[PDB]
Amino acid sequence: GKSYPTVSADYQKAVEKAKKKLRGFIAEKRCAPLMLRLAWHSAGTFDKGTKTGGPFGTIKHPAELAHSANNGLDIAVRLLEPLKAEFPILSYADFYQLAGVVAVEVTGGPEVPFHPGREDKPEPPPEGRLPDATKGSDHLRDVFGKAMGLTDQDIVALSGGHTIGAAHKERSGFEGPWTSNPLIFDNSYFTELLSGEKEGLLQLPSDKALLSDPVFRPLVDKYAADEDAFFADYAEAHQKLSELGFADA
Amino acid sequence: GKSYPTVSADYQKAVEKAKKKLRGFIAEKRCAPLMLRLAWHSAGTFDKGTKTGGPFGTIKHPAELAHSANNGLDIAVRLLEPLKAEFPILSYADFYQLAGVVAVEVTGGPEVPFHPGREDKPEPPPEGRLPDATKGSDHLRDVFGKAMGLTDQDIVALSGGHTIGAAHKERSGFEGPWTSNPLIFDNSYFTELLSGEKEGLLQLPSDKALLSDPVFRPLVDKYAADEDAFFADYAEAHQKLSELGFADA
Numbered sequence: 029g030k031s032y033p034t035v036s037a038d039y040q041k042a043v044e045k046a047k048k049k050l051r052g053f054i055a056e057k058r059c060a061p062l063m064l065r066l067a068w069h070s071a072g073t074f075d076k077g078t079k080t081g082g083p084f085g086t087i088k089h090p091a092e093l094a095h096s097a098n099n100g101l102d103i104a105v106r107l108l109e110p111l112k113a114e115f116p117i118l119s120y121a122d123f124y125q126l127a128g129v130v131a132v133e134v135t136g137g138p139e140v141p142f143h144p145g146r147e148d149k150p151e152p153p154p155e156g157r158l159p160d161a162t163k164g165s166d167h168l169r170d171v172f173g174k175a176m177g178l179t180d181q182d183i184v185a186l187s188g189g190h191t192i193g194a195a196h197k198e199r200s201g202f203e204g205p206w207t208s209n210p211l212i213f214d215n216s217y218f219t220e221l222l223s224g225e226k227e228g229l230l231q232l233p234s235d236k237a238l239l240s241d242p243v244f245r246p247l248v249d250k251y252a253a254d255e256d257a258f259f260a261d262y263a264e265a266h267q268k269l270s271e272l273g274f275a276d277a
Numbered sequence: 278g279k280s281y282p283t284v285s286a287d288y289q290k291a292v293e294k295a296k297k298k299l300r301g302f303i304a305e306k307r308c309a310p311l312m313l314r315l316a317w318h319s320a321g322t323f324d325k326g327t328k329t330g331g332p333f334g335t336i337k338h339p340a341e342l343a344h345s346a347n348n349g350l351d352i353a354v355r356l357l358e359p360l361k362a363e364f365p366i367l368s369y370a371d372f373y374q375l376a377g378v379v380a381v382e383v384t385g386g387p388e389v390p391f392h393p394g395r396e397d398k399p400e401p402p403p404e405g406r407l408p409d410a411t412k413g414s415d416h417l418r419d420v421f422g423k424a425m426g427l428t429d430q431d432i433v434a435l436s437g438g439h440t441i442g443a444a445h446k447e448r449s450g451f452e453g454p455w456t457s458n459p460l461i462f463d464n465s466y467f468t469e470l471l472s473g474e475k476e477g478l479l480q481l482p483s484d485k486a487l488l489s490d491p492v493f494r495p496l497v498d499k500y501a502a503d504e505d506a507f508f509a510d511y512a513e514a515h516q517k518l519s520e521l522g523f524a525d526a
């Protein structure tokens with residue numbers, strides 16, 4: 029049900045130019061997984077019932093950066109500031125979601141559609157809305173479903189964002205990559221999830237919860253078997269995520 | 278703009294009977310100021326914009342009791358549990374606001390009108406909405422005005438609740454009573470505020486802020502000069518406070 033705001037031609041020019049510079053920067057710095065995380069944690073605080081939180085620029089605020097769920101994302105914010113300063117017309121809100129869309133594209137994933145127009149809001153949401161890696165399916169539906177308003181299908185496909193990147197013991201406490209090729213966006217997260225625990229590879233309890241839920245497990249199976257299906261469902265879910273509370277939510 | 282819900286006759290019987298038992302209990306235990314504080318801190322978390330928080334029973338939850346603003350109110354909650362258990366039909370939400378109305382009446386203050394029907398909600402609001410004693414007039418309008426939706430007049434009159442009770446260094450860190458007769462509800466809070474700092478009596482920076490604001494100071498002056506006016510404005514404000522988010526807000 030989205031109705032995206034009109035933005036000036038100069039604004040659209042800056043988007044296009046920012047998108048290209050983000051590709052080169054993110055590729056050079058090898059920081060696509062951290063930028064995807066930055067985009068997700070920005071959006072993932074949306075609560076449909078109160079219409080608070082969401083991808084509106086607040087993650088750069090030191091008070092939101094201090095949320096323990098956000099450990100290490102100050103690095104992300106810092107890395108992007110010089111480039112953002114080249115695009116003063118853009119909202120931080122738009123800039124961070126664009127970086128997430130680009131992070132996915134330059135690691136070889138699907139092209140997530142992007143619509144500009146998000147405004148930078150003044151107040152960060154309360155801490156505690158992002159998911160707890162130590163919990164399971166009920167918790168996941170509470171956060172993605174009851175708060176953000178995404179579907180069970182969205183939960184599984186977005187979990188596949190872990191196909192890139194790694195945990196760090198000094199940030200969450202968990203450690204290592206989910207896949208053997210953590211700078212490559214593919215369906216390997218699901219393939220590893222199905223094969224058991226491979227030495228050196230990470231599985232959060234929240235990942236494992238997908239294997240035991242009667243709705244989530246068919247989806248893991250479909251994605252492990254069909255990367256195209258994964259990419260389609262991923263692109264849908266990431267667009268919805270990136271637009272929570274925006275242009276009608 | 279209130280439209281109060283219908284409640285059963287058995288519910289109204291329990292209100293009337295609870296009101297009388299609360300008088301005797303609160304008088305015997307000399308805990309009227311702590312019960313007023315309990316009622317206020319229950320209500321004072323309302324945010325009109327999101328319609329979250331407010332006098333809906335959540336302060337008895339250990340997670341809300343743990344808010345540092347609420348230090349010492351677990352005592353209040355404990356004191357009331359035996360009596361509440363005599364009125365299982367009543368919501369905790371109604372019971373705590375009734376105790377606040379009674380606390381004011383048995384110390385000799387105005388009769389604040391009371392309407393039953395508040396429901397006990399499952400989730401406590403985020404911490405941090407209650408006012409900071411170390412701040413001033415802007416802060417007060419942010420909390421009472423922008424969040425709760427009360428008037429500048431309401432802020433000054435409700436500040437007069439400090440005419441009963443005292444701070445404790447092991448609860449907020451501040452210490453002592455605002456008045457020489459802290460179990461007597463009268464306009465003495467304003468009279469002391471005007472006379473300067475009397476030895477042994479407390480003034481928070483938030484109290485003092487009332488003296489320097491061009492809207493609040495006329496009100497302090499009116500109340501110090503006219504206790505009847507104070508009681509009228511107090512009764513209005515406390516009813517509005519006790520009904521935030523309830524029966525239309």
Ligand code: HEM
Nearest residue numbers: 061062064068159160161186189193194195196199200234
């Ligand atoms: C489903 C529930 C989720 C939980 C419990 C969760 C939890 C975690 C944890 C604990 C970390 C490691 C942080 C560290 O120590 O560095 C992590 C990292 C990561 N998360 Fe998730 N996450 C979830 C969903 C998501 C979603 C929906 C996305 C985006 C589509 C995502 C993208 C990532 C990425 C890319 C990393 C790697 C970061 C890096 O390499 O530095 N995650 N998550």
Ligand code: HEM
Nearest residue numbers: 310311313317408409410435438442443444445448449483
């Ligand atoms: C206006 C901003 C307010 C601030 C900054 C504030 C702050 C404080 C503080 C710091 C304490 C002492 C807590 C302790 O250490 O025990 C206190 C106590 C108290 N507050 Fe206020 N308060 C405010 C408004 C209110 C309102 C609106 C009411 C109710 C009408 C109220 C009723 C009381 C009462 C009765 C006590 C005495 C409690 C006792 O004797 O144990 N206050 N407040």
Ligand SMILES: [K+]
Nearest residue numbers: 191207209212
């Ligand atoms: K991978």
Ligand SMILES: [K+]
Nearest residue numbers: 440456458461
């Ligand atoms: K007094």
